[PDB]
Design a protein around this ligand. Structure first.
Ligand SMILES: [Mg+2]
Ligand SMILES: [Mg+2]
Lengths: 223, 224
């Protein structure tokens, strides 16, 4: 929506054991979607300015079109410095559908971002292109288990072997885990049993306005 | 002109030939080619069966996305095997992983039709194309192949083993047959055996060879 300016919503990512909020996924050249990125960082530093969300990470969905456009890191780097955001506080979620040439260029960008203290995550994991291959080449930090897998996690026994295998990969690759699409208590408890404690989903929390997040972050926890 | 090429698939424990993947030595282009291959491979395959060799092995044939998802394809394959007296379960059609969304989910019905004919189905180059992880549970494919990339530098490359270790577990859950491709080094062969994959293809195991040469190999039954 437009208020003359962009109205972003923020999907909280929580520790499911404690209920504690650990991060917030910001939801909504030619494609100057750094406008989204810029708005999120501004709203994020605002929380930080108010002594809230100091220890949490801001997650922004970044396109591969957005990525590897020359002077992409210059913006991400500058944008963070602009709003006094410290290292590790921003994590760019990249789609698994990289499906891009210059895999070296992609790798130099990701390492480039790490030099600038920016984490990277694979969004919608298991649904894109070259799912398993990417794990070898790209120095990412976080994995995000797609809606698809978490949806019927408890109900279908057939989802668990897959999820158990994905968790193994993350563990084996030294990658942080996040489950997205937790809409049931069954999936919730199953993710906990097998060692996936970070998650997002309608059961846990809904996309909320910047002000609403700041309030939630003031508590620092949810049921 | 072109000619068929056969990459044998062996049990790395014994050295016994369990199957042979038909390859070509170097409406749509590939649509015609693969349909020719299917017929020629099956023809050449029955010639072995006639000579009493490879009587109980599988013939693996790569199927293009265009050949599949054509009305009459499933019935056509049956028509090929009826013709060359190939028995039930003696053919396994490899399909590239990037057919999940590249074709409609009626793929499920195609497989269902193919299983009724007595035709196995393998997922080639797994983890490289558009992933099927979402639908592996719902898909009745029989075999699952470990792509060349994860096998090539297996052991030396640290990223390979976890991926190989993962895919094995998946196949084990859904009752899928595990075949490794691109086994270049004994280092790779050694790990696969230790981690639970005995079927494999590779230059180390056996080079791709002609139909006549395959007969000779099948007559022996093994490689060293
Ligand atoms: Mg996301
Ligand atoms: Mg193949």
């Amino acid at each position: 929506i437009e208020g003359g300016a962009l109205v972003l919503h923020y999907l909280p990512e929580i520790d499911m054991r404690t209920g504690e909020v650990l991060a917030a996924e910001a939801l909504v050249a030619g494609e100057l979607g750094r406008w989204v990125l810029r708005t999120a960082c501004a709203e994020f530093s605002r929380w930080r300015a108010n002594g809230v969300g100091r220890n949490i990470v801001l997650r922004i969905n970044v396109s591969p079109v957005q990525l590897v456009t020359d002077g992409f890191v210059e913006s991400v780097a500058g944008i963070m410095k602009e709003f006094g955001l410290p290292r590790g506080s921003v994590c760019l979620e990249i789609t698994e559908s990289v499906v891009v040439q210059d895999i070296e260029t992609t790798r130099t960008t990701l390492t480039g971002l790490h030099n600038v203290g920016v984490q990277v995550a694979i969004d919608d994991f298991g649904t894109g292109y070259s799912v398993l291959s990417l794990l070898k080449s790209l120095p990412v930090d976080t994995l995000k288990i797609d809606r698809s897998f978490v949806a019927e996690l408890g109900s279908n026994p057939g989802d668990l072997p897959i999820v158990r295998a994905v968790i193994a990969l993350a563990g084996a690759f030294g990658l942080q885990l996040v489950a997205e699409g937790v809409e049931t208590e069954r999936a919730a408890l199953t993710l906990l049993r097998h060692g996936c404690y970070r998650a997002q989903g309608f059961l846990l929390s809904k996309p909320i306005l910047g002000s609403e997040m700041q309030t939630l972050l003031a508590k620092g926890r949810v049921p």
